[PDB]
């Protein structure tokens, strides 16, 4: 079976802004006035439906996730691209994941532009909800020490 769920998490320190704006679509964004996170998902069948950005002091957890009812088309190759853009970032660079052996087909790239973050963690997680929890593919990236964001709720950007 193929994954029917994609979870993207981005944890960041330090952040100075709590207010954000979201626009989901082919190129989904979460942005504050100091950081923009841009996600693409070409040829990935599960559709991204929600996101969040929530802060405790200067620590942020954020992410995008899909509906979990439709399985990936095994005839198309899911490509997840993610870019974290700092306000005055001058040059892009690629992050390298901590593992490269996976159970399911997918490709991903994670890029950061600027050095405004002392800690940046990214997880791209593909799961077949029909399969045991330990069979998920977890693609993990860390620029520094790994942030603990346990128990920070997934508040969305809408202030209405």
Numbering used by the authors: 161 to 320
From the primary publication:
In addition to the anti-TNF activity attributed to the N-terminal four cysteine-rich domains (CRDs) homologous to host TNF receptors, CrmB and CrmD have anti-chemokine activity attributed to a unique C-terminal extension (∼160 aa), named as the SECRET domain (smallpox virus-encoded chemokine receptor). Biochemical analysis revealed that the SECRET domain binds a subset of human and mouse CC, CXC and C chemokines, including CCL28, CCL25, CCL20, CXCL12, CXCL13, CXCL14, and XCL1. The identification of other poxvirus genes encoding homologues with the SECRET domain indicates that the SECRET domain represents a new family of viral CKBPs, which has specific folding to allow its binding with chemokines, either independently or fused with vTNFRs. Here we report the crystal structures of the SECRET domain of CrmD encoded by an ECTV strain and the complex of it with chemokine CX3CL1.
The crystal structure of the SECRET domain (residues S162−D320) was determined at a resolution of 1.57 Å by using single-wavelength anomalous dispersion (SAD) method with a Br-soaked derivative. There are two SECRET domains (molecules A and B) in the asymmetric unit, related by a non-symmetrical two-fold axis with an r.m.s.d. of 0.62 Å for all Cα atoms. Although these two monomers bind each other tightly with a buried surface of ∼1160 Å2, the size exclusion chromatography revealed that it is monomeric in solution. The SECRET domain monomer adopts a β-sandwich fold, consisting of two parallel β-sheets and the connecting loops. The β-sheet I consists of five anti-parallel strands 1, 5, 6, 10 and 11. The β-sheet II consists of six strands, which can be further divided into two segments (antiparallel strands 2, 3, 4 and 7; antiparallel strands 8 and 9).
